[PDB]
Design an enzyme around this catalytic site. Structure first.
Site, PDB file in Angstrom:
ATOM      1  N   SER A 137       1.060  -1.176  -0.057  1.00 28.37           N
ATOM      2  CA  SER A 137      -0.139  -0.003  -0.160  1.00 28.37           C
ATOM      3  C   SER A 137       0.744   1.175   0.064  1.00 28.37           C
ATOM      4  CB  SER A 137      -1.073  -0.115   1.212  1.00 28.37           C
ATOM      5  OG  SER A 137      -1.965   0.930   0.839  1.00 28.37           O
ATOM      6  N   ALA A 138       0.817   2.275   0.899  1.00 32.24           N
ATOM      7  CA  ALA A 138       1.504   3.362   1.188  1.00 32.24           C
ATOM      8  C   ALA A 138       3.214   3.013   1.291  1.00 32.24           C
ATOM      9  CB  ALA A 138       1.281   4.361   1.919  1.00 32.24           C
ATOM     10  N   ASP A 164       0.724  -3.830  -4.377  1.00 31.89           N
ATOM     11  CA  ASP A 164      -0.537  -2.960  -4.647  1.00 31.89           C
ATOM     12  C   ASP A 164      -0.302  -1.739  -4.547  1.00 31.89           C
ATOM     13  OD1 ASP A 164      -2.819  -4.378  -5.609  1.00 31.89           O
ATOM     14  OD2 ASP A 164      -4.128  -3.328  -3.837  1.00 31.89           O
TER      15      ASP A 164
END
Lengths: 273, 268
Positions: A137-138, A164
């Site tokens: 993610s981040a 992702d």
């Protein structure tokens, strides 16, 4: 006017809750990014120290860069690390934290101050061993930028795993689902300190761009949409042109790294060395 | 740490301008009351009737240490002048625990107007405000006069225009520093301040029918390099314009009796 009167807080957490209850995660993220301007911050001259957190033990060192959400920190890898451990010949693993979420750490003033500080912890932890960076993610954005900084300074990882990833300034589906994310990262766990840290790194990641790296990339992407997608295609999906390997992981943007972190561990393992 | 600790860092670093902007933004997440779901407002008696003088109603200001306590120095002096007019304070909803902010100017003023007219019981009244409270006493006078009533007078103390504040622009940071010490500000007071900053930024100094007693500070609160009187509060068309000893803040602290002797004479 009031979505849940039963709530009796008043700080940023309560304001956060009222944002997510009324579908205004975007407005709130901006609020948090503007708030982080008033947090003391460390620069390259007086860098606060960073310590990598051991996670497990022929493969290189695997290094998981923590995400920038309120739920984030070394914990987020523990399922992946545990599944990684019981594997034959598995790599040793560590975790790079993003400073400032914990009390009372300063956030970085600049990305250079951050990556200078993380890079010195990293090379001290790794010795001459080759390493492979990873993030989700981040934390995937954070690991690609650290990569940029390492390679720009004549060093680098042996490969980059990016689970992702999206562009914060061009969020695609992650903007449509922003309120859905803000929902999850709270329940997973949040005070003012962690929330303004998230604001500061959100400011960092508005200057982020999907630029190339030398290190071979592994791009893992969730099989299931985390929110609903009215167009009905896979246009919501994370993308990375020029990835060495792209691999689907069961679960959604989050459950790929909890309930299905076993499969990510296995595919990462089959990709290393 | 929270918004209290960010507020002090902003003030410690000279950035009270961005802090007011942040709290304005942060406040847009406060639960609000409309005209339909009105939050009741109650007047606070300060000084009994000592006539035939009108009831003085001070309007609470909008900073973190505002409210009916900002009228203690003034109301004490007032109650030992001979033949005094009575006085009560009108708070601004949203600053106390469990209170919501007004959704619109219309919502706040219909609440206040209701309360104020109840408490008056027929008596004529004079609205009085200091600093941002002046803008609120003015904005309520407009509201009342628009809807068929209004005060027999209006007392504006050191009123500036928030969108174009002139000297109060320059001194915003001294403002913020003083209102903190005067207090201990919590998140709920900072976010209320912010809600009232948002409404005050749209405020303009339109004319009112009632006679205006304009009271202004003799001393520049902060330093004023220009060396002229371009720092002073300005009300064209006021009935009376009196200077009061002290600066923006002490004019209602140490020299409140000065303000009250003057008001008292103007009323009668």
């Amino acid at each position: 006017t009031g979505a849940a009167p039963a709530d009796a807080g008043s700080g940023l957490p309560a304001l956060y809750r009222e944002a997510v209850r009324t579908g205004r995660a975007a407005e709130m993220a901006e609020l948090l990014a503007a708030a982080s301007r008033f947090r003391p911050a460390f620069g390259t001259a007086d860098r606060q120290p960073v310590a990598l957190v051991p996670l497990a033990d022929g493969l290189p060192l695997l290094v998981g860069c923590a995400g920038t959400a309120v739920a984030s920190g070394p914990v987020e890898f523990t399922a992946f690390a545990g599944a990684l451990a019981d594997l034959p010949a598995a790599a040793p693993m560590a975790a790079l934290p993003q400073p400032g979420f914990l009390p009372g750490e300063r956030v970085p003033a600049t990305p250079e101050a951050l990556f200078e500080a993380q890079a010195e912890a990293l090379l001290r932890y790794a010795a001459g061993r080759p390493f492979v960076l990873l993030g989700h993610s981040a934390g995937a954005n954070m690991a690609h930028a650290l990569t940029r900084h390492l390679e720009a300074n004549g060093g680098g990882p042996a490969g980059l795993v990016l689970m992702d990833i999206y562009t914060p300034a061009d969020p695609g589906a992650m903007g449509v689902w922003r309120n859905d994310m803000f929902q999850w990262v709270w329940r997973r766990s949040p005070d003012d300190h962690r929330l303004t840290a998230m604001g500061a790194y959100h400011r960092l990641l508005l200057d982020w761009s999907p630029t190339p790296v030398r290190a071979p990339v592994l791009h893992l992407r969730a099989a299931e949409p985390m929110g609903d997608w009215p167009p009905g295609d896979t246009g919501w999906q994370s993308h990375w042109d020029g990835a060495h390997t792209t691999a689907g992981i069961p679960g959604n943007h989050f459950t790929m790294m909890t309930e299905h972190a076993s499969a990510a561990a296995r595919l990462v393992h089959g990709w290393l060395a």
